Coordinates of C-alpha atoms and ligand atoms in Angstrom, one line a residue:
Chain A
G1 CA 139.0 103.3 117.8
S2 CA 137.0 100.4 116.3
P3 CA 137.0 97.0 118.0
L4 CA 135.1 95.2 115.2
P5 CA 137.0 92.6 113.2
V6 CA 137.0 92.4 109.4
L7 CA 133.4 92.1 108.2
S8 CA 132.7 90.1 105.1
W9 CA 129.3 91.9 104.5
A10 CA 130.6 95.5 104.8
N11 CA 133.6 97.7 105.5
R12 CA 134.3 97.2 109.2
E13 CA 135.0 100.9 109.8
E14 CA 131.9 101.8 107.9
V15 CA 129.6 99.8 110.1
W16 CA 131.2 101.1 113.2
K17 CA 131.1 104.7 112.0
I18 CA 127.3 104.4 111.4
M19 CA 126.8 103.1 114.9
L20 CA 128.8 106.0 116.3
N21 CA 127.2 108.6 114.0
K22 CA 123.8 107.5 115.2
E23 CA 124.6 108.2 118.8
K24 CA 125.0 111.9 117.9
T25 CA 121.5 111.9 116.3
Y26 CA 119.9 110.5 119.5
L27 CA 120.5 113.1 122.2
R28 CA 120.4 112.6 126.0
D29 CA 119.9 115.2 128.7
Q30 CA 120.7 114.1 132.3
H31 CA 118.8 117.2 133.6
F32 CA 115.5 117.0 131.5
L33 CA 113.6 116.7 134.8
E34 CA 114.2 120.4 135.3
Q35 CA 111.6 120.9 132.6
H36 CA 109.2 119.1 134.9
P37 CA 109.6 120.9 138.2
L38 CA 106.9 118.9 140.0
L39 CA 108.6 115.6 139.2
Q40 CA 111.5 114.1 141.2
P41 CA 114.4 111.8 140.0
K42 CA 113.2 108.9 142.2
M43 CA 109.9 108.7 140.4
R44 CA 111.8 107.8 137.2
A45 CA 113.5 105.0 139.1
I46 CA 110.2 103.6 140.5
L47 CA 108.7 103.8 137.0
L48 CA 111.6 102.1 135.1
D49 CA 111.8 99.4 137.8
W50 CA 108.1 98.7 137.4
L51 CA 108.7 98.3 133.7
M52 CA 111.4 95.8 134.4
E53 CA 109.0 93.7 136.5
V54 CA 106.4 94.0 133.8
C55 CA 108.9 92.8 131.2
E56 CA 109.8 89.7 133.3
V57 CA 106.2 88.7 133.8
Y58 CA 105.5 88.7 130.1
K59 CA 109.1 87.6 129.4
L60 CA 110.0 90.6 127.2
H61 CA 113.6 91.0 126.0
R62 CA 116.1 93.3 127.7
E63 CA 116.3 95.3 124.5
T64 CA 112.5 96.0 124.7
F65 CA 112.9 97.5 128.2
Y66 CA 115.8 99.8 127.2
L67 CA 113.9 100.9 124.2
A68 CA 111.1 102.0 126.5
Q69 CA 113.6 103.7 128.8
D70 CA 115.1 105.6 125.9
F71 CA 111.7 106.5 124.5
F72 CA 110.6 107.8 127.9
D73 CA 113.8 109.9 128.5
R74 CA 113.9 111.4 125.0
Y75 CA 110.1 112.2 125.1
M76 CA 110.3 114.0 128.4
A77 CA 113.1 116.1 127.0
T78 CA 110.6 117.4 124.4
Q79 CA 107.8 118.1 126.9
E80 CA 107.3 120.4 129.8
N81 CA 105.4 120.2 133.1
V82 CA 104.2 116.6 133.6
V83 CA 102.3 115.3 136.6
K84 CA 102.9 112.1 138.5
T85 CA 99.7 110.3 137.4
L86 CA 100.7 110.9 133.8
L87 CA 104.0 109.0 134.2
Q88 CA 102.4 105.5 134.3
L89 CA 100.7 106.1 130.9
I90 CA 103.9 107.4 129.3
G91 CA 105.9 104.5 130.6
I92 CA 103.5 101.7 129.6
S93 CA 103.0 103.2 126.2
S94 CA 106.7 103.5 125.6
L95 CA 106.9 99.8 126.4
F96 CA 103.9 99.2 124.1
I97 CA 105.8 100.9 121.2
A98 CA 109.0 99.0 122.2
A99 CA 107.3 95.6 122.4
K100 CA 105.7 95.9 119.0
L101 CA 109.1 96.9 117.5
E102 CA 111.2 94.1 119.1
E103 CA 109.1 91.1 119.9
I104 CA 108.0 88.5 117.3
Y105 CA 104.7 87.9 119.1
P106 CA 104.2 90.9 121.3
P107 CA 101.4 91.2 123.9
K108 CA 98.1 92.6 123.0
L109 CA 96.9 96.1 123.8
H110 CA 94.6 95.0 126.6
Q111 CA 97.4 93.2 128.4
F112 CA 99.3 96.5 128.6
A113 CA 96.1 98.2 129.9
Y114 CA 95.7 95.2 132.3
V115 CA 98.9 95.5 134.2
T116 CA 98.1 99.2 135.0
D117 CA 95.5 98.0 137.6
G118 CA 92.8 99.8 135.6
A119 CA 94.6 103.2 135.6
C120 CA 95.3 103.2 131.8
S121 CA 92.7 102.5 129.2
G122 CA 93.5 100.7 126.0
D123 CA 92.5 103.8 124.1
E124 CA 94.6 106.0 126.5
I125 CA 97.6 103.9 125.5
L126 CA 96.8 104.3 121.8
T127 CA 96.6 108.1 122.2
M128 CA 99.9 108.2 124.2
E129 CA 101.8 106.0 121.7
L130 CA 101.0 108.4 118.9
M131 CA 102.0 111.4 120.9
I132 CA 105.3 109.7 121.9
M133 CA 106.2 108.7 118.3
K134 CA 105.2 112.1 116.9
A135 CA 107.2 114.0 119.5
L136 CA 110.3 111.8 118.9
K137 CA 110.0 112.6 115.2
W138 CA 109.5 108.8 114.7
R139 CA 113.2 108.3 115.6
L140 CA 112.6 105.0 117.3
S141 CA 115.8 103.0 116.4
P142 CA 118.4 103.9 119.1
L143 CA 121.4 101.8 120.2
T144 CA 120.3 100.9 123.7
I145 CA 122.5 100.5 126.7
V146 CA 122.0 96.7 126.6
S147 CA 122.7 96.5 122.8
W148 CA 126.2 97.8 123.3
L149 CA 126.8 95.1 125.9
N150 CA 125.9 92.5 123.3
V151 CA 128.5 93.9 121.0
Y152 CA 131.1 94.0 123.8
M153 CA 130.4 90.4 124.8
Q154 CA 130.7 89.1 121.2
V155 CA 134.1 90.7 120.5
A156 CA 135.4 89.5 123.9
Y157 CA 134.7 85.9 122.8
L158 CA 135.9 86.1 119.2
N159 CA 138.1 83.4 117.6
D160 CA 140.0 83.4 114.3
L161 CA 136.6 82.7 112.5
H162 CA 135.8 86.5 113.1
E163 CA 132.1 85.6 112.6
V164 CA 130.7 88.6 114.5
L165 CA 127.0 87.9 113.7
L166 CA 126.7 84.4 115.3
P167 CA 126.4 84.8 119.1
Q168 CA 128.9 83.1 121.3
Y169 CA 129.6 84.2 124.9
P170 CA 128.7 82.9 128.4
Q171 CA 125.2 83.8 129.4
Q172 CA 126.2 83.7 133.1
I173 CA 128.5 86.8 133.1
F174 CA 126.2 88.6 130.6
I175 CA 123.3 88.8 133.0
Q176 CA 125.8 89.8 135.8
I177 CA 127.0 92.9 133.8
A178 CA 123.4 93.6 132.7
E179 CA 122.4 93.4 136.4
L180 CA 124.9 96.3 137.1
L181 CA 123.5 98.2 134.1
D182 CA 119.9 97.7 135.3
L183 CA 120.8 99.4 138.6
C184 CA 122.7 102.3 137.0
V185 CA 119.8 103.1 134.6
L186 CA 117.5 103.9 137.5
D187 CA 119.7 106.9 138.3
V188 CA 119.0 109.8 136.0
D189 CA 122.6 111.1 136.1
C190 CA 123.6 108.2 133.8
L191 CA 122.4 110.2 130.8
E192 CA 125.5 112.4 131.2
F193 CA 127.5 109.5 129.7
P194 CA 126.8 108.0 126.3
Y195 CA 125.1 104.6 126.2
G196 CA 128.3 103.0 124.8
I197 CA 130.3 104.5 127.6
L198 CA 127.9 103.1 130.2
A199 CA 128.1 99.6 128.9
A200 CA 131.9 99.6 128.6
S201 CA 132.2 100.9 132.2
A202 CA 130.0 98.1 133.5
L203 CA 132.1 95.5 131.6
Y204 CA 135.3 97.0 133.0
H205 CA 134.0 96.5 136.6
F206 CA 133.6 92.7 135.8
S207 CA 136.9 92.3 134.0
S208 CA 139.7 94.8 133.2
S209 CA 140.6 97.9 131.2
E210 CA 142.5 95.7 128.7
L211 CA 139.4 93.6 127.8
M212 CA 137.3 96.8 127.8
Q213 CA 139.5 98.6 125.3
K214 CA 139.8 95.5 123.2
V215 CA 136.1 95.1 122.7
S216 CA 134.8 98.7 123.1
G217 CA 137.6 100.7 121.3
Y218 CA 137.4 103.4 124.0
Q219 CA 140.5 104.4 125.9
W220 CA 140.6 104.4 129.7
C221 CA 140.4 108.2 129.8
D222 CA 137.0 108.0 127.9
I223 CA 135.4 105.9 130.6
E224 CA 137.3 107.1 133.7
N225 CA 134.6 109.7 134.6
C226 CA 131.9 107.1 134.0
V227 CA 133.8 104.3 135.9
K228 CA 134.2 106.7 138.9
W229 CA 130.5 107.5 138.8
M230 CA 129.6 103.8 138.5
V231 CA 131.8 103.1 141.5
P232 CA 129.0 102.9 144.2
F233 CA 126.7 100.8 141.9
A234 CA 129.4 98.3 141.2
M235 CA 130.2 97.5 144.9
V236 CA 126.5 97.2 145.8
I237 CA 126.3 94.4 143.3
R238 CA 129.6 93.0 144.6
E239 CA 128.4 93.1 148.3
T240 CA 125.2 91.1 147.5
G241 CA 126.8 88.8 144.9
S242 CA 126.2 88.0 141.3
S243 CA 122.8 86.6 140.3
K244 CA 122.2 83.3 138.6
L245 CA 120.9 82.6 135.1
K246 CA 117.1 82.0 135.1
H247 CA 115.2 79.6 132.9
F248 CA 111.9 80.8 131.5
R249 CA 109.0 78.6 130.4
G250 CA 108.7 78.7 126.6
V251 CA 112.0 80.5 126.2
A252 CA 114.9 78.4 124.8
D253 CA 117.9 78.2 127.0
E254 CA 120.1 79.6 124.1
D255 CA 118.1 82.8 124.5
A256 CA 117.4 82.8 128.3
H257 CA 120.0 85.5 129.0
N258 CA 118.1 88.0 126.7
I259 CA 115.0 88.0 128.9
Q260 CA 114.6 91.0 131.2
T261 CA 114.8 90.1 134.9
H262 CA 113.8 92.0 138.0
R263 CA 114.9 92.0 141.7
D264 CA 114.2 94.4 144.5
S265 CA 116.9 96.7 143.1
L266 CA 115.2 99.9 144.5
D267 CA 116.8 99.2 147.9
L268 CA 120.2 98.7 146.2
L269 CA 119.9 102.1 144.4
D270 CA 119.7 104.0 147.7
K271 CA 123.0 102.5 149.0
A272 CA 124.8 103.9 146.0
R273 CA 124.0 107.5 147.0
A274 CA 126.8 107.8 149.6
Chain B
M1 CA 97.0 117.0 105.0
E2 CA 95.8 119.3 102.2
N3 CA 97.2 120.5 98.8
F4 CA 97.4 116.8 97.8
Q5 CA 94.9 115.4 95.3
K6 CA 94.5 111.7 94.8
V7 CA 95.1 110.8 91.1
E8 CA 95.1 107.0 90.9
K9 CA 95.0 104.0 93.2
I10 CA 98.3 102.1 93.1
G11 CA 97.1 99.0 95.0
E12 CA 96.1 97.5 98.3
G13 CA 98.0 94.6 99.8
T14 CA 100.1 93.7 102.8
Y15 CA 101.7 97.2 102.7
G16 CA 98.3 98.9 103.0
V17 CA 96.3 101.3 100.7
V18 CA 98.6 103.1 98.4
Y19 CA 97.4 106.0 96.3
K20 CA 99.1 108.2 93.7
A21 CA 98.7 111.9 94.7
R22 CA 99.7 115.1 93.0
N23 CA 100.6 118.5 94.7
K24 CA 98.3 121.0 93.0
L25 CA 100.6 124.0 93.5
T26 CA 104.1 122.6 92.9
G27 CA 102.9 119.8 90.5
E28 CA 104.9 117.3 92.6
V29 CA 103.6 113.7 92.6
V30 CA 104.0 111.4 95.6
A31 CA 102.7 108.0 96.8
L32 CA 100.4 108.0 99.8
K33 CA 100.1 104.9 102.0
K34 CA 96.9 105.3 104.1
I35 CA 96.5 103.6 107.4
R36 CA 93.0 103.6 109.0
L37 CA 93.8 103.7 112.7
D38 CA 90.1 103.2 113.8
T39 CA 90.3 99.7 112.4
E40 CA 93.5 98.8 114.2
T41 CA 92.8 97.4 117.7
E42 CA 96.6 97.4 118.4
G43 CA 97.2 101.0 117.4
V44 CA 99.8 101.7 114.7
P45 CA 100.8 98.4 113.2
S46 CA 104.2 97.0 114.2
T47 CA 105.1 96.8 110.5
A48 CA 104.2 100.5 110.1
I49 CA 106.3 101.6 113.1
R50 CA 109.3 99.5 111.9
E51 CA 109.2 100.8 108.3
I52 CA 108.9 104.5 109.3
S53 CA 111.8 104.4 111.8
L54 CA 114.0 102.4 109.4
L55 CA 113.3 104.6 106.4
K56 CA 113.8 107.8 108.4
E57 CA 117.5 106.6 108.8
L58 CA 117.9 104.9 105.4
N59 CA 118.3 107.9 103.0
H60 CA 119.9 106.6 99.9
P61 CA 119.5 107.3 96.1
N62 CA 118.5 103.6 95.5
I63 CA 115.9 103.4 98.4
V64 CA 112.4 104.8 98.0
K65 CA 112.3 107.8 100.3
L66 CA 109.8 108.4 103.1
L67 CA 109.0 112.1 102.9
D68 CA 106.6 112.7 105.7
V69 CA 104.3 111.0 108.3
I70 CA 101.1 112.9 108.7
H71 CA 98.5 111.9 111.4
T72 CA 95.0 113.2 111.1
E73 CA 91.4 112.1 111.6
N74 CA 92.4 108.7 113.0
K75 CA 94.4 108.1 109.8
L76 CA 98.1 107.8 109.4
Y77 CA 99.4 109.0 106.0
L78 CA 102.9 107.9 104.9
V79 CA 104.2 110.2 102.1
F80 CA 106.6 108.3 99.8
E81 CA 108.7 109.2 96.7
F82 CA 106.8 108.2 93.5
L83 CA 108.1 105.9 90.8
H84 CA 106.0 105.0 87.8
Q85 CA 106.6 101.2 87.4
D86 CA 107.8 98.2 89.3
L87 CA 110.4 95.7 87.9
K88 CA 108.0 92.8 87.4
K89 CA 105.8 94.9 85.1
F90 CA 108.9 96.1 83.3
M91 CA 110.2 92.5 82.9
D92 CA 106.8 91.4 81.6
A93 CA 106.7 94.2 79.1
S94 CA 110.3 93.3 78.0
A95 CA 109.7 89.5 77.9
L96 CA 109.6 89.4 74.1
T97 CA 112.6 91.5 73.2
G98 CA 114.5 90.9 76.5
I99 CA 116.0 93.5 78.7
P100 CA 119.3 94.9 77.2
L101 CA 122.3 93.6 79.0
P102 CA 123.7 97.0 79.8
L103 CA 120.4 97.8 81.6
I104 CA 120.5 94.5 83.5
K105 CA 124.0 95.3 84.7
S106 CA 123.0 98.9 85.6
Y107 CA 120.0 97.8 87.5
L108 CA 121.8 95.0 89.4
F109 CA 124.6 97.4 90.2
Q110 CA 122.1 100.0 91.7
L111 CA 120.3 97.2 93.6
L112 CA 123.5 96.0 95.2
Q113 CA 124.4 99.6 96.2
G114 CA 121.1 100.1 97.9
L115 CA 121.5 96.7 99.6
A116 CA 125.0 97.4 100.7
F117 CA 123.8 100.6 102.2
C118 CA 121.1 98.6 104.1
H119 CA 123.5 96.0 105.4
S120 CA 126.1 98.5 106.5
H121 CA 123.3 100.2 108.5
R122 CA 122.5 96.7 109.9
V123 CA 119.1 96.4 108.2
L124 CA 117.7 93.3 106.4
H125 CA 115.1 93.8 103.8
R126 CA 113.7 90.2 103.8
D127 CA 111.3 90.7 100.9
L128 CA 113.3 91.4 97.8
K129 CA 111.1 90.6 94.8
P130 CA 110.5 92.3 91.4
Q131 CA 107.2 93.8 92.8
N132 CA 109.2 95.7 95.5
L133 CA 111.8 97.0 93.0
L134 CA 110.6 100.4 91.5
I135 CA 112.0 102.1 88.5
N136 CA 111.7 105.7 87.1
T137 CA 112.0 107.2 83.7
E138 CA 115.6 108.2 84.3
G139 CA 117.3 104.8 84.4
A140 CA 117.2 104.3 88.2
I141 CA 115.8 101.4 90.3
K142 CA 115.1 101.6 94.0
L143 CA 114.2 99.3 96.9
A144 CA 110.7 99.6 98.3
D145 CA 108.4 98.1 100.9
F146 CA 110.3 97.8 104.2
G147 CA 107.4 96.5 106.1
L148 CA 109.1 93.1 106.4
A149 CA 112.5 94.7 107.1
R150 CA 114.3 94.3 110.4
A151 CA 117.4 95.8 112.0
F152 CA 119.8 93.1 113.2
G153 CA 122.1 93.4 116.1
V154 CA 125.8 92.4 116.4
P155 CA 125.6 89.5 117.1
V156 CA 122.1 88.6 115.8
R157 CA 119.5 86.4 117.6
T158 CA 116.7 84.2 116.4
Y159 CA 114.4 86.3 114.2
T160 CA 111.1 85.7 112.5
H161 CA 110.9 82.4 110.7
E162 CA 109.6 81.7 107.1
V163 CA 110.4 85.2 105.8
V164 CA 110.7 86.3 102.1
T165 CA 108.3 85.4 99.3
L166 CA 108.6 81.7 98.4
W167 CA 110.2 82.1 94.9
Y168 CA 113.0 84.3 96.3
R169 CA 113.5 82.6 99.7
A170 CA 117.1 81.4 100.5
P171 CA 117.6 77.7 101.1
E172 CA 118.8 78.2 104.7
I173 CA 115.3 79.7 105.5
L174 CA 113.6 76.7 103.8
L175 CA 115.8 74.3 105.9
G176 CA 114.9 76.0 109.2
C177 CA 118.0 77.8 110.3
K178 CA 118.0 79.3 113.8
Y179 CA 120.0 82.5 112.9
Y180 CA 120.2 84.4 109.6
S181 CA 121.3 87.8 108.4
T182 CA 122.4 89.6 105.2
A183 CA 122.8 86.5 103.1
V184 CA 119.1 86.0 102.5
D185 CA 118.8 89.3 100.6
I186 CA 121.7 88.4 98.3
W187 CA 120.0 85.1 97.4
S188 CA 116.9 87.1 96.5
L189 CA 118.9 89.4 94.2
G190 CA 120.6 86.4 92.6
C191 CA 117.1 85.1 91.7
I192 CA 116.1 88.5 90.4
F193 CA 119.4 88.7 88.5
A194 CA 118.8 85.4 86.7
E195 CA 115.1 86.3 86.2
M196 CA 116.1 89.5 84.3
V197 CA 118.4 87.4 82.1
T198 CA 116.1 84.5 81.3
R199 CA 112.8 86.6 81.5
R200 CA 111.3 83.9 83.8
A201 CA 111.5 83.1 87.5
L202 CA 114.5 81.0 88.5
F203 CA 112.9 78.8 91.1
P204 CA 109.0 79.1 90.8
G205 CA 107.9 76.7 93.5
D206 CA 104.4 76.2 94.9
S207 CA 105.4 74.8 98.3
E208 CA 108.3 74.8 100.7
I209 CA 109.5 71.4 99.7
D210 CA 108.9 72.0 96.0
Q211 CA 110.8 75.3 96.2
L212 CA 113.7 73.5 97.9
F213 CA 113.7 70.7 95.2
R214 CA 113.7 73.3 92.4
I215 CA 116.8 74.8 94.0
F216 CA 118.3 71.3 94.3
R217 CA 117.6 70.5 90.6
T218 CA 119.5 73.5 89.4
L219 CA 122.4 73.9 91.9
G220 CA 122.7 70.3 93.0
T221 CA 121.7 68.6 96.2
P222 CA 124.1 70.2 98.8
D223 CA 126.2 68.1 101.2
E224 CA 128.6 68.8 104.0
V225 CA 131.5 69.6 101.6
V226 CA 129.7 72.4 99.8
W227 CA 127.7 73.5 102.9
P228 CA 129.1 72.5 106.3
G229 CA 126.3 71.6 108.7
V230 CA 123.5 71.2 106.1
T231 CA 122.8 67.6 107.2
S232 CA 122.2 68.7 110.7
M233 CA 119.6 71.4 109.9
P234 CA 116.1 70.9 111.2
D235 CA 114.3 70.5 107.9
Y236 CA 117.0 68.5 106.2
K237 CA 116.1 64.9 105.3
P238 CA 118.5 62.1 104.2
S239 CA 115.8 61.1 101.7
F240 CA 116.4 64.2 99.5
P241 CA 117.0 63.1 95.9
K242 CA 120.5 63.5 94.5
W243 CA 120.5 66.0 91.6
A244 CA 123.6 67.1 89.7
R245 CA 124.5 70.7 89.5
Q246 CA 123.6 72.1 86.1
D247 CA 126.0 74.0 83.9
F248 CA 125.3 77.7 84.1
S249 CA 125.8 77.9 80.3
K250 CA 122.3 76.3 80.3
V251 CA 120.8 78.0 83.3
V252 CA 121.6 81.5 82.1
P253 CA 122.6 81.2 78.5
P254 CA 122.9 84.9 77.7
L255 CA 125.2 85.5 80.6
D256 CA 129.0 85.7 79.9
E257 CA 131.8 84.4 82.0
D258 CA 131.8 87.3 84.5
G259 CA 128.0 87.1 84.8
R260 CA 127.9 83.4 85.6
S261 CA 130.7 83.8 88.2
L262 CA 128.8 86.6 90.1
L263 CA 125.5 84.7 89.9
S264 CA 127.2 81.6 91.3
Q265 CA 128.6 83.5 94.3
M266 CA 125.2 85.1 94.9
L267 CA 123.6 81.6 94.9
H268 CA 126.2 79.9 97.1
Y269 CA 124.5 77.4 99.4
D270 CA 126.6 78.3 102.4
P271 CA 125.4 81.7 103.8
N272 CA 128.9 82.3 105.2
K273 CA 130.4 81.9 101.7
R274 CA 127.7 83.7 99.8
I275 CA 129.1 86.9 98.3
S276 CA 128.3 90.1 100.1
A277 CA 126.6 93.2 98.5
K278 CA 129.8 95.2 99.0
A279 CA 132.0 92.5 97.5
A280 CA 129.6 92.0 94.6
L281 CA 130.0 95.6 93.7
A282 CA 133.8 94.9 93.2
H283 CA 133.2 91.9 91.0
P284 CA 134.7 92.0 87.5
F285 CA 131.2 92.0 86.1
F286 CA 130.9 95.7 87.0
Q287 CA 134.6 96.5 86.1
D288 CA 133.3 98.5 83.1
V289 CA 130.7 100.4 85.2
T290 CA 132.7 101.3 88.2
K291 CA 136.4 102.1 88.9
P292 CA 138.1 101.2 92.2
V293 CA 139.0 103.8 94.8
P294 CA 142.5 103.9 96.4
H295 CA 142.6 101.9 99.6
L296 CA 144.4 103.3 102.5
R297 CA 146.7 100.6 103.9
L298 CA 146.1 101.8 107.5
Ligands
LIG301 C1 103.1 99.3 96.3 C2 104.4 98.5 96.7 N1 104.7 98.4 98.1 C3 105.3 99.5 98.9 O1 105.5 99.5 100.0 O2 105.8 100.7 98.1 C4 106.1 101.8 99.0 C5 104.7 102.4 99.4 C6 104.3 103.4 98.3 C7 105.6 104.0 97.6 C8 105.7 104.0 96.0 C9 105.2 103.1 95.0 C10 105.5 103.7 93.7 N2 105.2 103.1 92.4 C11 104.5 101.8 92.1 O3 104.1 101.2 93.1 C12 104.2 101.3 90.6 C13 102.6 100.8 90.3 C14 101.7 101.9 89.8 C15 100.3 101.7 89.5 C16 99.5 102.8 89.0 C17 100.0 104.1 89.0 N3 101.3 104.3 89.3 C18 102.1 103.3 89.7 N4 106.2 104.9 93.9 N5 106.3 105.0 95.3 C19 106.7 103.1 98.2 C20 105.5 98.6 95.7 C21 104.7 97.4 95.8

């Protein structure tokens, strides 16, 4: 189904079809680390969590992080046999490509080399960003996990105006659901489920299946397998509580929810294993 | 990166260094945008990464195609489809005799189709001007230069301010709106539409305030009735002079009744009321060019 209202600028079913048709172009592989036998799934969690903290220090948007995560996962699916010391360069260069794509005033190249504690040169990043974009066939416009949550939050708070392009939803509950998604993305087995399924399953845990289906278009049976897998991650967030909305210097409050945050979520990821 | 022989330099600007190349074996001609990577401290430019990724997913008959992206010798070559002339050079060559009305309608119809394809894919062009509209010798016209383009989300957020070349910049941009989307491209096409009719630019301003006053002098100084919320916009001033809206019989004399109606809806002050590209295709101005499809009531 399609949860978008009537769109004045295009056929509502045409815009939704294109968004769904793109998700078939961008492939995921929850077992791409079998192509890299020396790597372990936890190394990916430590890398992505480090990129989250880097994003918060430079106040990069959540969309920028999930672009880097998607660039990292799809690039490793094209490569074979990668060492641990090569992971930091691939991750920081994926964030460099993502920051230049998403931010209005992105950080400079030397700042991306600066946060690596001197382990990645500015020219090492330039070499890596070319290899990443060429290996991905320059397909660098995916619908991230966090971009779907933005769609689901807009339709949930829609009025009779049906103006789907002007944002209007509570920032408080948005960062709470994003907090659940930031934890689940550290686990590699999330790639089994499409990005749109993952976001709808996290919204369901903070609301209901009626609101989920109203704003995502997916029936309960489409997300049941994902909801059951997201079960341990949801309660870990419920046991510790929902985080508060942060204010960031230089970032307007009407955009403060879009800034990537970071907690010590690596401890919370291990509790979701049992 | 062989088999291609440079034939003529097309130009150098914000896009980059564009050459006209010709395949020696097949006789095929392309346009080569060359990017010297050794002179780019920040690696591949952000405008280059955006345009490549957007054009690799915007395959349409009215969009200049990106054919290949070759990287060699610290150079990044973008291979484009070649068209022999831009619209501005065509309008200048047609300034004396005028562009025939069936050709203006055919060109605007094709431009709206390419823009509707962009907006349905959630992509703003944000630099629609005659220099970026390319024509071939087979009656077609295509959108070019997506370096200033951006994919917008649903919902959108605050994007880059002061976009679009000044003559084709929508009034909501000039007044400093926080959010914007597809309406800014329609305003540009409305200016290009009238420019094809009158053979001169519609609002040729030399500053932000002069561009806004030229719009006010033709369409009238907007108020809360014609544009709700205009008096609260950041760059709005109560000291704006009060000009009366001019009769479109004088603004675009050659345009008939259906033409003035479509142009008015493309130049509506309110971005929420401004006609969309898809709806403009269904306007009675193109009722002789296109025929409607049956609509499933389900
Ligand atoms: C360059 C620009 N900006 C841009 O980004 O255009 C992209 C990049 C190159 C691609 C392109 C351009 C093109 N024809 C022309 O430019 C007409 C001018 C000319 C002059 C001499 C010999 N022949 C042709 N065919 N294909 C698409 C359009 C403004």
